[PDB]
Symmetry: C3
Subunit: 195 residues, 3 copies
Amino acid sequence: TEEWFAARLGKVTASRVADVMTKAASRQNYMAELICQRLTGTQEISNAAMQRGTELEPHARARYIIETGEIVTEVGLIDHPTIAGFGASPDGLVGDTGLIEIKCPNTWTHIETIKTGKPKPEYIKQMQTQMACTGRQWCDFVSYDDRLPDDMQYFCTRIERDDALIAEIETEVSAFLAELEAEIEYLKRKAAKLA
Amino acid sequence: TEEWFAARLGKVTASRVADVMTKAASRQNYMAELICQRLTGTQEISNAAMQRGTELEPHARARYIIETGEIVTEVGLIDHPTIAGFGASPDGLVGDTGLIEIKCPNTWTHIETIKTGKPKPEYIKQMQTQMACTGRQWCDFVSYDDRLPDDMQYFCTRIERDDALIAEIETEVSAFLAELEAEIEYLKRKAAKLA
Amino acid sequence: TEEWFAARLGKVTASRVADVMTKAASRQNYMAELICQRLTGTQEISNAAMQRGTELEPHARARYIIETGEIVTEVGLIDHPTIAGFGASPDGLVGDTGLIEIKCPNTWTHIETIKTGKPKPEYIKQMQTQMACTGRQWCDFVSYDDRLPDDMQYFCTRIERDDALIAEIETEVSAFLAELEAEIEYLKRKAAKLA
Ligand SMILES: Nc1ncnc2c1ncn2[C@H]1C[C@H](O)[C@@H](COP(=O)(O)O)O1
Ligand SMILES: Nc1ncnc2c1ncn2[C@H]1C[C@H](O)[C@@H](COP(=O)(O)O)O1
Ligand SMILES: Nc1ncnc2c1ncn2[C@H]1C[C@H](O)[C@@H](COP(=O)(O)O)O1
Ligand SMILES: [Mg+2]
Ligand SMILES: [Mg+2]
Ligand SMILES: [Mg+2]
C-alpha cells in the first residue's frame, strides 16, 4: 500500500540490512538510493517471480497458522525504538513475542532451504533487524512453494533474538545513516552556496 | 508444440549438452532446472532475436533443400537408444543417414561463422548428441541470415559422426543423470521422513 | 528523426568515441555493430530512464538559454570535415563558436556530476569529437534533473577545444575505420569467391 511506501521513504529497512553491512558496491548503491529518495521525495519502481511470490504469500501465511495455531497480526513499518530513520516490515506479529517472515522464492531457492535447513545470512540479518525494531524474541522463518510435491511445499524454522548480532547491526546502521545524512548535508551546502 | 514440451520435461537434451559438460555454474544451473522440472511437473518460460530467428528457420530449411536437393523429414524429440531421460530434437532427418541443424543467429554471430568456417564447440556437442540419439552418420550445420548481401546469407558445413566425442558425452551425461536422480531421491527422503 | 538515423548508418559518432578508444570488448562490440549496419543496410533497436531523459532534454535546453541568453541552433549529424564516415550530433550550436551537450541522467549520476564538477572522460571525448566535426571552440556541458531541490537541478561547465585530444581521437578513429572497412572488404571477398 502507498501509506507504507511513504513511511519507508528514505529509511534503512530490515531487508536491506545485508547491503548496508556487506563486505562492497551494494552498500553505496543502497546509499545512493536512499539519498535520492530523500532528496527527490520519492522512490523508483519487478519480474513475474516476485509478482507470483507476492500472490502466494497469503497461502504461506495460512499454511503457517494451519501448522501452528498461532495468532498472527499483520503490521505496517515498525520504526526502530531509538535509531531514527530505520525500520522493519515483518510479515506478521506472532503471538506475544514472535514474528513471522515468509518467502515464496523460485523452486530452486526453496529446495536449497529444505536442503540446508538454514535461512541465508542476509535473511538472518533481516529478521534480527525485525526483532530489534519490535523488541520481539524470535522469528519464524517460512519458505513456501506450492509447485512441489506436498511434503516439500512448506518449510519452517525459528531464529531466536540475538542481542550481539543486533548490537553490530545497530552500529553499522547508525554509521551508515550518519554517512547518508552528511552526504545529503554536503550536497546541499555545495548547491546552496553555489546558487 | 506442447506435445514435445512434455516429451522434454526433465530430460537432458542435445542443445544443453555443452552445459552438462562445461569445465562450471552452467552445469549446476542446468541441473537445478531439470530437478525442478521433474519435481514440479513443468518447465519455466525469449527475446525478439530468438523470436525472429524462429520465423526465419523455415526460410533456412528451404534454402538448404534448394541448395542440395535432399529429402528432409521434420521430427520430434528422439530419445537416446540406451541412456534413459536423454534425447535430441534435430531440425530434420536428411536423407537416410544425415541430419540438419539450423541457426538463425544475430548478424554478427552469423558473420563469425562465415569467418571461421566452423560451428562453435557447443554446437559440435549438440550435433554429436543428435547423431548419438538417431544413430545417424553426419549432420549438416546451416547458418542463415537474410539481412545480409546475397552471398553472405547462407552457410553450410558437414560434421561427421565421431564415436569418440559421443563416447565422452554419453559418460558425462550418464554421470550427470545419476547425480540429478540421486539429488531428487535425496530431497524426497529428507522431505518424506521429515513429514 | 528517421532522416538522421540514415545519416548515422554505419558511421563512428561522437558519443561512441570512448568505445572506439577504450583500453577492450566495447571496441569490437562497437565495430561489429557498425559492420552489421553497413552490410545489412540498417540499425538495431531503450529503458524508461532513457525515454524519460529524452522528454526532459527540452526543459534542460530552455533552462540553459534562461541561464545564459545564448542563441542556440539545433542541428543534425555533422560529418567530420576530413575523416569520411565519422560525425557528431551536438545538442545545439551555441552562438558563433560554442556547442551544447545536455544530459538528463538518473538522479544519482546527476549528483555525482554536481559532486565532482567534471564530466566523465567519455563525455570529454564526445564533446571534443563534436568540436572536431564542427570546428567549434568550446562546448557547454549541461546536466539536468528536475526531481531535485531547486538548487541541485541544473549544472553547467565549459570544456574548451583541445587539438591534442582531438589529434589522438582522429587517429584512433581513422585506424578503427580502416579496420572496419577492411573487415567488410574481407568478408565480401570470402563470400564472393566462395559463391
Ligand atoms: N517496492 C516493494 N513492493 C512490494 N514489496 C516490497 C517492495 N520492496 C520490498 N518489498 C518486500 C521485500 C521485503 O520482504 C519487504 C520490505 O521489508 P523491510 O523490512 O521494510 O525492508 O517487502
Ligand atoms: N522452449 C523452447 N521453445 C522453442 N524452442 C526451443 C525451446 N527451448 C529450446 N529450443 C530450441 C533450441 C534448440 O535448438 C532446440 C532444442 O533441442 P534439444 O536437442 O531438444 O535440446 O529447440
Ligand atoms: N537510437 C537513438 N535514438 C535517440 N537518441 C539516440 C540514439 N542513439 C544515440 N542517441 C543519443 C545519444 C547521443 O547523445 C546522441 C548521438 O550522438 P552522436 O554524436 O551522433 O553519437 O543521441
Ligand atoms: Mg517476506
Ligand atoms: Mg536449430
Ligand atoms: Mg545529449
